[PDB]
């Protein structure tokens, strides 16, 4: 099957998606391609809410029975939310990677870190992300 790549998301080459959820907040998850490649997710290590992250910093990891993969901050900011549903139901990452399986939110204060307008420039659009995939 062709992996789902919503056109209304931005992405990283490392298979994270980024949804602007507010003026200063993005929601982050892993892509359909990513979850399928990882396999059934058995554990998601999420950063603590309040964690300051820089773009590309490892903030967590996703684990299947076969694979462990780092999760990188797609943008700089502060972790403002994490998906607690993934504690008991880590497979939401597999079943609904762009919905219920979201990982966390990063909030930007345009003072401490790049404003979202700036931060967005580093991310891939759907077409670009599709182009990176095999």
d(CA 120, CA 134): 24
Q: How many other C-beta atoms are found inside a 10 Å radius of the C-beta of residue 80?
A: 19
Dig out the tokens for 17 from the structure. Answer: 């998606």
Q: Are 73 and 54 in contact (CB under 8 A)?
A: yes
Distance CA 127, CA 38 (A): 22
Domain that holds residue 3: 1-134
Which H, E and C letters describe the chain, residue by residue? CCCCCCCCCEECCCCEEEEEEECCEEEEEECHHHHHHHCCEEEEECCCCCCEECCCCEEEEEEECCCEEEEECCCCEEEEEECCHHHHCCCHHHHCCCCCCCCEEEECCCCCCCCHHHHHCCCECHHHHHHHCC
What is the distance of C-alpha 43 from the center of its chain?
15
Resolution in A: 1.8
Q: How was this structure determined?
A: X-ray
Buried b (16+ CB within 10 A) or exposed e, 5-14: bbeebbbbee
**CB atoms inside a 10 Å sphere around CB 78:** 20
* Residues 32 and 3 sit within 8 Å (Cβ to Cβ): yes
Nearest C-alpha neighbor of 55 from the set 126, 8, 113: 113
* Close Cβ partners of 16 (under 8 Å, ≥ 6 residues apart): 28, 29, 30, 31, 34, 71, 72, 74
CATH number of the domain bearing residue 120: 2.40.50.100
Domain count, the chain: 1
């Amino acid at each position: 099957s062709m992996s789902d790549i919503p056109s209304d998301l931005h992405y990283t080459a490392e298979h994270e998606w980024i949804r602007r959820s507010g003026d200063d907040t993005v929601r982050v998850g892993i892509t359909d391609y990513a979850q399928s490649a990882l396999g059934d997710v058995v554990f998601v290590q999420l950063p603590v809410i309040g964690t300051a992250v820089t773009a590309g910093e490892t903030f967590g990891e996703v684990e299947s029975t076969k694979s462990v993969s780092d999760l990188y901050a797609p943008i700089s900011g502060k972790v403002s939310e994490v998906n607690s549903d993934l504690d008991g139901t880590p497979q939401l990452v597999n079943s609904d990677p762009y919905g219920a399986g979201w990982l966390l939110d990063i909030q930007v204060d345009s003072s401490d870190v790049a404003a979202l307008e700036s931060a967005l420039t580093t991310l891939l659009d759907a077409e670009a992300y599709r182009g990176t995939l095999t």
